[PDB]
Amino acid sequence: MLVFIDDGSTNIKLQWQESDGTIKQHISPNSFKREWAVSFGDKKVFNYTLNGEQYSFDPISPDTNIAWQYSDVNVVAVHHALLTSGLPVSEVDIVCTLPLTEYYDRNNQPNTENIERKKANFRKKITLNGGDTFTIKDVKVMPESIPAGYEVLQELDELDSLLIIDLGGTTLDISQVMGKLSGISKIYGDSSLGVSLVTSAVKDALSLARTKGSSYLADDIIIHRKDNNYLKQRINDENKISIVTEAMNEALRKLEQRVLNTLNEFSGYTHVMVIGGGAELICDAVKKHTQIRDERFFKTNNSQYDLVNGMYLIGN
Ligand SMILES: Nc1ncnc2c1ncn2[C@@H]1O[C@H](COP(=O)(O)OP(=O)(O)O)[C@@H](O)[C@H]1O
Ligand SMILES: [Mg+2]
């Protein structure tokens, strides 16, 4: 069994294909705490032991990004994602991801050290209370931005270049890749902002428990921010709707504000692709800004899965 895992620090996205050929996708959050959760009978709990420490899944409080890729929690969050994927517990080969500035050094040269460190991480032994855990055998690592733009790059001429814009949970990374992956023109990593900016704006606009718990509510609002019908039903208060919308827009304006300043650091690209969970949130601005023709602008309605799908297609 081969599973493609885009383990971001906000959400872990899984992709793999079943015997009957159907391609499956799964998403598991990065929500854990350093202690087992006790259940006296009605709550199903996931209690792990990673190295010596016990961990458990739960809708905790939202509080490094980079350090996380080599952390014990990362391993736990991935196993947990496997355990809740529907897949049968088994030995599995995986392909995971490393952020652009972790996978590549300053000269856009792959960083061997980080890569081997990433692989070595899943070498950590994990156990599940009252249950069995998957067994991670082979581990390959792929850079983040590139796999999502590959099938487009194949079609590009060596002189054209795809500008890939990834808006994740806590970072915004942009890269420019030469046609037919014949070279990386530029990488711009910015870990100062992500969708969490908007997320927190919503949790505050509606005095909401700043915890992974309400993240589903915050998400629904962000996603259905243009449909007053949905907003009215999700929000039983009329007054809180105008408020959340104003707070949601200032945060969005900040996102668009930054991606645009950053794009002014890139030049010579002929095609544009927007990916990541928040792709939908900055899509219009960059399309407008770059003024690239419709047939050369790439976006999907499953943006949070563009990377792992691209990884799947490459190494399936
Ligand atoms: N179409 C969308 N519009 C707005 N938010 C989205 C969309 N798809 C996913 N998200 C949200 O963005 C976050 C996931 O973004 P993602 O880039 O996958 O994060 P990660 O940084 O973990 O890789 C989650 O909070 C998720 O609910
Ligand atoms: Mg990501």
Domains and CATH numbers, the chain: 1-159+300-316 (3.30.420.40), 160-299 (3.30.420.40)
The secondary structure element, H or E, covering residue 251 is helix 239-263
- Amino acid identity of 255? L
- The experimental resolution of this structure, in angstroms, equals 2.0
Distance, CA of 299 to CA of 312 (rounded, Å)? 18
Q: Ligand 1 mean position to 42 CA, how many Å?
A: 31
- Cα 97 to Cα 158: distance, rounded to the nearest angstrom: 25
Strand residue runs (E) in the chain:
2-7, 11-17, 23-29, 32-33, 47-49, 54-57, 91-98, 127-128, 135-143, 161-167, 172-178, 184-190, 271-275, 297-298
C-alpha–C-alpha distance, residues 290 and 285, integer Å: 8
Q: Check the chain for breaks (C–N over 2.5 Å) and list the residue before each, or none.
A: 63
CB-defined site of ligand 1, < 6 Å: 8-11, 168-170, 195, 215, 219, 222-223, 276-278, 280-281, 303-304
Ligand nearest 144 Cα, by number? 2
Q: End-to-end distance of the chain based on CA atoms, in angstroms?
A: 10
**What is the Cα–Cα distance from 302 to 287, expressed in whole angstroms?**
18
Closest ligand to residue 65's CA: 1
d(CA 120, CA 54): 20
Structure tokens at 180: 């037919």
Strands 2-7 and 11-17: antiparallel
With 0-12 / 13-18 / 19 or more C-beta atoms within 10 angstroms meaning exposed / middle / buried, residue 269 is buried
Mutate to test the pocket of ligand 1, among 219, 226, 281, 283 (most ligand atoms within 8 A of CB): 219
